[PDB]
Design a protein around this ligand. Sequence first.
Ligand SMILES: CCn1cc(C(=O)O)c(=O)c2cc(Br)c(N3CCNCC3)cc21
Length: 420
Amino acid sequence: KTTKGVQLLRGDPKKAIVRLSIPMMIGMSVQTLYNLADGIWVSGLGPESLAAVGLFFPVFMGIIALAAGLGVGTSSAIARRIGARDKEGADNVAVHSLILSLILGVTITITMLPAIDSLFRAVELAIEYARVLLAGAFIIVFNNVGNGILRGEGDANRAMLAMVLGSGLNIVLDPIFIYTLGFGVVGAAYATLLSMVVTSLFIAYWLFVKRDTYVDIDFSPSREILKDILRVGLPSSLSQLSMSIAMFFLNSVAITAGGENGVAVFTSAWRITMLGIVPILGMAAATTSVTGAAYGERNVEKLETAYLYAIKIAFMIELAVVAFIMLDLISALRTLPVFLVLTPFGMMTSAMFQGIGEGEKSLILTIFRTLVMQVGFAYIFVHYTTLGLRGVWIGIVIGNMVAAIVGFLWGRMRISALKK
Ligand SMILES: CCn1cc(C(=O)O)c(=O)c2cc(Br)c(N3CCNCC3)cc21
């Protein structure tokens, strides 16, 4: 009838925010540690292989964006059916998403793999890197969908295990296929492939075989469900997309402000802050589940409680994290991380927008945060001020301040509108 994850969402919102974020944090931690390590192995492979990276990166990030967004849409739609105590509706979303993962999965493969040979034309290495990655696009999507099912139910521990067993297998298999065996840059993708396959066997085990999930995988092709999944899924894909593009724009700002000296400082600072933003990414994922559950119950008070408690806790964790960092890049490690305490005020709001099904507002807030304020102010402090590399860090921090104020008020505004 019930499950430890579903009994968490339907109960004390303060306990739900905590008990669900912690496993998500550990999962995201290993995930970020992979990105840190995978970038290192690729670095030093030569200039030709790095040129191949920038060839497939816009396509690579396209696949990950579509997959991650769809998973969020799955998570959002399942949490809302759980809150409304709608079992058959919660079962229907899961089956719909798995079919959605199949269609979207094979579509990406059939629409890109034959058309990747012409768009690229270092080039040969990119096509091979594309070939391995595109051939397993359906696997990547299924993973995020199966992840969204668990994350939307409250199975934060089984979802944590997914990415931990996930990223962990890649941290190990990365140097093996890149250096020991000697595939090169393509070995990173082949490590990614082989890793993704193993975990897709573990997810299908829990879902289909073990049946430990709250939902039963009742199915009937409904338009309301399809509208409900894409309403959050589609804008979330553009959110992660613009987030990477912001990293590219900020890079060119670091190019103008300090040069190549220079850009290396920005890459070092962006690495340590990626690990320091994990408690926010881990809690934002938990917030979407709780607020979504609260939205289904039509309990605004509980929704407001969980949204305000997720910020307060994450704010004080960051105060601690900032303290870790405080005690060239050494100068920027004392001014830049101050944007990490402003971040939970904005990331939690967009996450609760996804929770209540309004993904469009989540996309607008994210664009304003990552592009308009972060890149916008950083470009301004570097082109119109005597400050060089230092002004870039100021712009990011001062940009987050504005995006935090707008985000928090917009969040409290819509929470007030949910009563009238
Ligand atoms: C070994 C599977 N895997 C490989 C990766 C890679 O090679 O870059 C991943 O980034 C990855 C990420 C997640 Br989240 C992840 N999870 C969460 C979603 N379900 C599958 C496990 C798995 C990943």
